[PDB]
RNA sequence: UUAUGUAUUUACUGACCU
C-alpha cells in the first residue's frame, strides 16, 4: 500500500484470474488506495491465485468478498498495466499487534 | 580468463572423466563425498556449461585456493579431450 | 581462473526491469544508445514516420525496416 | 481556439492486408489496415471490382495485423496488436455490421 | 480523382497567379537523371560489345539500347547513395500536360 | 583529469553557463551543453546549501491570506470572521449548551451568489511561464 | 507488378496487392503454375560465380489487371485552388512515390 | 508583411522582424516546446498554425503584448524573450504535410484543411457559440465512455499522444454516433437530453455547414 | 553566526492499525 511503505508487490505477469478484496477493505483501490472512481478490474497472476489462495483478498489475504478495482487515477497514469498487484509479504504490522 | 575458451559436451566422454575427479577431491578435502562428485556430475551434463558459476559453486566448499587449482586443472581436461575426436584428454590418452 | 566479481543481485529495491531507465552514474553514451534503441523501435512501430521515412530515399518500407533493425545493434557506434 | 476534428476523405495507403472467411461464408474477404483505419472489402469475383463493407477507426496504430482459424472452425479472427498494451480479437458479423470484440487482454504499458 | 503522372517525387508546387499555371519541382535519391540512365546503358552495350565478342552478338547491345521498359511499371533504376534525380516542371492544370521541363544535374 | 573553468569554458559554445563546479562533473561537455540547451530549466539554487531550503524563513512575520477578489465579494469573509468573534466570547458552558441546543440560519447567505462568483465573476489569476522557478526570496525580489 | 507491403492471394484466383504508394490493385490469375515456357532454375543446380540465374523482364503473362483501387498516399504537397473557374475550389494534390507519382485533382462531384 | 515565420526543423516556429529603416532580421519571439515542424500555416496576424513529424497539430498565438520593436544578450531560456504560447495540440496519427485555410463550399465557412501523408484529408473547424463547444464537448465525452475504440487504446490517450490534447473535438468519434444500437443511443440522448435524430440532425449540420 | 554528534522532550505526518 501506500501507508505501510515496506509491503512489496507480485508484479508478475497478469492473467486472467479477477482480483478480489476483503469485506475489511472493499471499495479500496489497490496502488492509490483510495475509495472513489473505480474504473478497471483487477487481474492477478497464476501463482498467486493458485488453490488456497482463490477468491482470497488482495491486500489482507483476508477472504474476499467483492471484486477489485483500480481508480481512475491508477487508470489514466497506467498503472493497472504493471505486473498484478498482489502484496506479497506481511511485515511489521499486523503481526507484532498480533503478539500485543 | 582460460576458463572462457568456450566447450561444448557433446564432444566429450564423462564417464572415464569421473573418477580422476572424485580422486582430485579425494585429494583436496581429504576425505570422500558424493555431492560435490555429483555436482561435478550434474554441472557438467548441460551441453554448454559455464566455468565461473562452476568455479564459484566450489569456491564455496573448498578454500578459493583449491576451487582455483581445480578450475585450472579440470577446464585443460576438458579443452584437450573436446579437441580430441575420441574424447579423452592427454592424462588418459597416453595412460 | 576468477577473481572476486561474484555480483548476482541483491536487495529488490524497485526492480528497474525496464530496459533504459538508467541510474545515476550512467554516461553520455549509455543513455543516449538508449535514445537511439527508442527512436527506431518508434520509426517502425508508427506507420507513418515509416512511410516518411521511405520517401526520401526511394527505399522500399522493408529495405527501410531492416536498415533500422540493423542499426538497433551498436548504433552510436563502440563504447 | 475552440476547434473541432473532421475527416472527409479518410485514409487510403494499406499498410497491412490479410484474408479469410471474415464473414463466415465459403467466399473470402480482405482485412486491410489503413494504419488508423481498420476496413473490410470483399473481392466480387464475378464483376471483379473491390467493394468495402465497412470501415471503423481503431483510434490506434494497428503494429500488427493477423487472422487464424480455429480448430475445426468456420470463421477467422482477426487478431490486432496495437500501440495500446491489449491483445485483442475481433470477429466480424455480417448481420449488424461491424466487428464485434471477442477479446482484450492487457500486458503492458501504452504508446 | 484525375491523375497527371509525373517522373519523380514531386516536393512542392507553386501557383503562377496571372495565367494559372502549375510550377512543379521533382526530386529522388538514389535516381538517375535520364542524361545518366543514356550514358549508363550506351556504357552498358560497349562493356557487352566489348567483353570478348569475336565468337559475338552485337544484337544484344543494340536491342538493349532500343527496348525502353516502362519504369511506372517495371521500378525506377536506384543509383546506389548520394545520387539525385530532379526536374522542374511547368504544367496545365487543366489538361495536365508537362508544358515546359528543365532537368537539373546528377546530384542537383 | 578535470580541466579547469579556463579550458572548459573556452571550448563550450555558449560560455556564460560554465560554472565553479562543473569541472567536478563526470562528463563536463554535455553537462554545459545541456545546460546551454535551449528550454531547459536549471537545477534549483539550493542543491549545495546548508539550509534546507526554507528554514532561511525563520523571524520574518508575514500576512495571513489574501482572499481572490470573487471571493470577497461574497461576504463570507466578514460573516466568517463575524461568528469567529462572537465565538471567541463563549465558554465551555455555552459551547457545550448549543452543541444540544443549535441556533441554526447564522451564515445562510445565498447559492445564486456563490454561483456567480465561481461562474460569472470567475478571474484569471497571473501564472508564470514554464521557467520561473522559485528560489527562497523572489518575492522580496519585486525590484525589477 | 508494383511493389506491394502485403499480398493476399486468394482461393477463385485472384491476387490482391497494396501498393504501399500509389494505387491497389486486384489482379486475376491468368496462368496458375506457368511451368511451361519459362527459364526456372533451382537450388541445387551447381551454379557459380554469384548469382549466375537472371531473368529477363516482361509485361503481363500470368495476370490480368481487374480492379484500380484508388489512394492518394503519400500526399505530399497540396493546395486549395480554384483554377478551373468552377464555383466550389479544387484540391491540387501531389502523390505517390516514383515513377508511379501522380499529380491528382479532386473535386467534390462524381464520376 | 513585416513579419517572419521562420520554422526550424527542430525547434520551433521563430519569430522575425524585418525593418525598413534598417534591413535588420530581429528574432523577438519564439515557442518553448521543441516541435519537429514539417509544414505551417498563417492564420491570424498573431497565431501559426503548424504540424509536426509525429503526426500533432499546434497551433501557437502570440500573447497580447509581444512588442515588435525590438532593435539590436541573455535571452530568457537560452533563446528569445517572449515566449508565445500553444492554444492547441491535437494527435492525428499521421504526418500531416500541408496546412492550408479556406473555404471549401460557396455559402459555407473558413475551416483549416490539412492534408496528411498517409492519404487521409481532414478540416479543423471553430465552434461559433459556446452552447455548440459545450454540446459536442459532453457527446464525446459520453463516448469515450459508451463507444471505446477498438485496439483498447484509450481515445483520450491517443489524441494526447505526445502533447497533452486541448481545445480539440474529435469529431470522428462523435460521427460514431450513428454507428451504435439504438439503445446506446437512447442512453447518450436522453443522457444529452435531446433525440437520437435529433443528435443525428445536429451532428451532421457541422458537416454540411463547414465541409463536404 | 550558519553546523555536528547525541542524551532528550514537545509537536507533526501516512483515511496506518483490532
Ligand atoms: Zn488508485
Ligand atoms: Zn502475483
Ligand atoms: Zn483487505
Known amino acids: 500500500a501506500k501507508h505501510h511503505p515496506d509491503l512489496i508487490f507480485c508484479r508478475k505477469q497478469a492473467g486472467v484470474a479477477i482480483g478480489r478484496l476483503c469485506e475489511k477493505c472493499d471499495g479500496k483501490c489497490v496502488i492509490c488506495d483510495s475509495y472513489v472512481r473505480p474504473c478497471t478490474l483487477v487481474r492477478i497472476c497464476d501463482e498467486c491465485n493458485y488453490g488456497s489462495y482463490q477468491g482470497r483478498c488482495v491486500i489482507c489475504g483476508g477472504p474476499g468478498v467483492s471484486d477489485a478495482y483500480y481508480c481512475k487515477e491508477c487508470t489514466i497514469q497506467e498503472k493497472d498495466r504493471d505486473g498484478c498487484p498482489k502484496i506479497v509479504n506481511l511485515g511489521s504490522s499486523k503481526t507484532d499487534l498480533f503478539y500485543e | 580468463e582460460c576458463l572462457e575458451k568456450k566447450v561444448d559436451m557433446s564432444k566429450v566422454n564423462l564417464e572415464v572423466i569421473k573418477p580422476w575427479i572424485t580422486k582430485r577431491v579425494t585429494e583436496i578435502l581429504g576425505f570422500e563425498d558424493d555431492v560435490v562428485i555429483e555436482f561435478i556430475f550434474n554441472q557438467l551434463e548441460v551441453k554448454n556449461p559455464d566455468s565461473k558459476m562452476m568455479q564459484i559453486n566450489l569456491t564455496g566448499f573448498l578454500n578459493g585456493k583449491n576451487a582455483r587449482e581445480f578450475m585450472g586443472e579440470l577446464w585443460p581436461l576438458l579443452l584437450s579431450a573436446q579437441e580430441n575426436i575420441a574424447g579423452i584428454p592427454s592424462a588418459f590418452l597416453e595412460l | 581462473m576468477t577473481d572476486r566479481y561474484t555480483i548476482h543481485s541483491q536487495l529488490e529495491h524497485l526492480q528497474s526491469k525496464y530496459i533504459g531507465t538508467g541510474h545515476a552514474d550512467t554516461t553520455k553514451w549509455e543513455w543516449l544508445v538508449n535514445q537511439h534503441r527508442d527512436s527506431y523501435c518508434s520509426y517502425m512501430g508508427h506507420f507513418d514516420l515509416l512511410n516518411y521515412f521511405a520517401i526520401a530515399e526511394n527505399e522500399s518500407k522493408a529495405r527501410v525496416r531492416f536498415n533500422l533493425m540493423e542499426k538497433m545493434l551498436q548504433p552510436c557506434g563502440p563504447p | 481556439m475552440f476547434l473541432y476534428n473532421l475527416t472527409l476523405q479518410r485514409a487510403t495507403g ?42 471503423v477507426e481503431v483510434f490506434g496504430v494497428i503494429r500488427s495485423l493477423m487472422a487464424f482459424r480455429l480448430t475445426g472452425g468456420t470463421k477467422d479472427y482477426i487478431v490486432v496488436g496495437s500501440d495500446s498494451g491489449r491483445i485483442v480479437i475481433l470477429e466480424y458479423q455480417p448481420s449488424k455490421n461491424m466487428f464485434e470484440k471477442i477479446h482484450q487482454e492487457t500486458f503492458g504499458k501504452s504508446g | 480523382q484525375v491523375a497527371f503522372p509525373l517522373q519523380y517525387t514531386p516536393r512542392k508546387f507553386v501557383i503562377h497567379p496571372e495565367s494559372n499555371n502549375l510550377i512543379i519541382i521533382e526530386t529522388d535519391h538514389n535516381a538517375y537523371t535520364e542524361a545518366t540512365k543514356a550514358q549508363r546503358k550506351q556504357q552498358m552495350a560497349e562493356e557487352m560489345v566489348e567483353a570478348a565478342g569475336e565468337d559475338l552478338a552485337a544484337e544484344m547491345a543494340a536491342a538493349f539500347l532500343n527496348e525502353n521498359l516502362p519504369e511506372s511499371i517495371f521500378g525506377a533504376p536506384k543509383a546506389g547513395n548520394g545520387q539525385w534525380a530532379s526536374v522542374i516542371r511547368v504544367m496545365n492544370p487543366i489538361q495536365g500536360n508537362t508544358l515546359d521541363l528543365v532537368q537539373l544535374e546528377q546530384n542537383e | 583529469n578535470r580541466f579547469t573553468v579556463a579550458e572548459l569554458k573556452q571550448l563550450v559554445a555558449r560560455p556564460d553557463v560554465v560554472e565553479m563546479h562543473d569541472v567536478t562533473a563526470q562528463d563536463p561537455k554535455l553537462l554545459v551543453h545541456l545546460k546551454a540547451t535551449r528550454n531547459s530549466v536549471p537545477v534549483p539554487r539550493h542543491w549545495c546549501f546548508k539550509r534546507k531550503y526554507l528554514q532561511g524563513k525563520r523571524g520574518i512575520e508575514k500576512p495571513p491570506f489574501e482572499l481572490p477578489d470573487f471571493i470577497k465579494r461574497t461576504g463570507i469573509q466578514e460573516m466568517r470572521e463575524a461568528l469567529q468573534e462572537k465565538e471567541e466570547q463563549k465558554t465551555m458552558k455555552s459551547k457545550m449548551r448549543e452543541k444540544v441546543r443549535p441556533k441554526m440560519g447564522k451564515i445562510d447567505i445565498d447559492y445564486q451568489k456563490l454561483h456567480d462568483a465561481f461562474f460569472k465573476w470567475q478571474t484569471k489569476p497571473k501564472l508564470t511561464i514554464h521557467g520561473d522557478l522559485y528560489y527562497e526570496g523572489k518575492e522580496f525580489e519585486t525590484r525589477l | 507488378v508494383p511493389v506491394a507491403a502485403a499480398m493476399c492471394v486468394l482461393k477463385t484466383g485472384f491476387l490482391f496487392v497494396a501498393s504501399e504508394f500509389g494505387n491497389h490493385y486486384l489482379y486475376q490469375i491468368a496462368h496458375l503454375g506457368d511451368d511451361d515456357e519459362e527459364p526456372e532454375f533451382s537450388s541445387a543446380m551447381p551454379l557459380e560465380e554469384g548469382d549466375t540465374f537472371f531473368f529477363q523482364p516482361r509485361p503481363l503473362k500470368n495476370l490480368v489487371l481487374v480492379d484500380e483501387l484508388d489512394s492518394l498516399s503519400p500526399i505530399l504537397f497540396c493546395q486549395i485552388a480554384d483554377l478551373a473557374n468552377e464555383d466550389t475550389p479544387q484540391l491540387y494534390v501531389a502523390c505517390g512515390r516514383g515513377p508511379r507519382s501522380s499529380l491528382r485533382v479532386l473535386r467534390h462531384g462524381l464520376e | ?75 530568457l531560456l537560452n533563446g528569445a524573450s517572449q515566449k508565445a504560447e500553444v492554444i492547441m495540440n491535437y494527435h492525428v496519427g499521421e504526418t500531416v504535410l500541408s496546412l492550408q485555410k479556406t473555404t471549401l463550399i460557396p455559402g459555407g465557412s473558413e475551416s483549416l484543411v490539412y492534408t496528411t501523408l498517409s492519404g487521409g484529408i481532414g478540416i479543423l473547424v471553430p465552434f461559433t457559440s459556446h452552447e455548440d463547444h459545450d454540446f459536442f464537448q459532453h457527446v464525446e465525452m459520453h463516448l469515450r465512455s459508451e463507444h471505446p475504440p477498438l485496439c483498447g487504446r484509450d481515445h483520450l490517450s491517443f489524441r494526447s499522444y505526445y502533447f497533452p490534447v486541448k481545445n480539440v473535438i474529435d469529431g470522428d468519434l462523435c460521427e460514431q454516433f450513428n454507428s451504435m444500437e439504438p439503445n446506446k443511443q437512447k442512453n447518450v440522448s436522453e443522457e444529452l437530453d435531446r433525440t437520437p435524430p435529433e443528435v443525428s440532425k445536429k451532428l451532421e449540420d457541422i458537416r454540411t455547414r463547414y465541409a463536404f
Open chain 8, 1 to 75: 508583411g513585416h513579419r517572419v515565420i521562420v520554422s526550424d526543423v527542430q525547434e520551433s516556429f521563430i519569430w522575425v522582424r524585418y525593418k525598413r529603416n534598417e534591413n535588420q532580421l530581429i528574432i523577438f519571439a519564439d515557442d518553448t516546446y521543441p516541435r519537429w515542424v514539417t509544414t505551417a500555416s498563417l492564420l491570424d496576424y498573431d497565431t501559426v498554425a503548424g504540424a509536426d513529424k509525429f503526426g500533432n497539430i499546434c497551433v501557437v498565438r502570440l500573447p497580447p503584448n509581444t512588442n515588435d520593436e525590438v532593435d539590436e544578450d541573455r535571452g
Open chain 4, 14 to 55: 494499406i499498410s497491412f492486408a490479410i484474408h479469410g472467411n471474415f464473414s463466415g461464408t465459403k467466399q473470402q474477404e480482405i482485412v486491410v489496415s489503413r494504419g488508423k483505419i481498420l476496413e473490410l472489402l470483399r473481392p466480387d469475383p464475378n464483376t471483379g471490382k473491390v467493394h468495402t463493407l465497412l470501415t
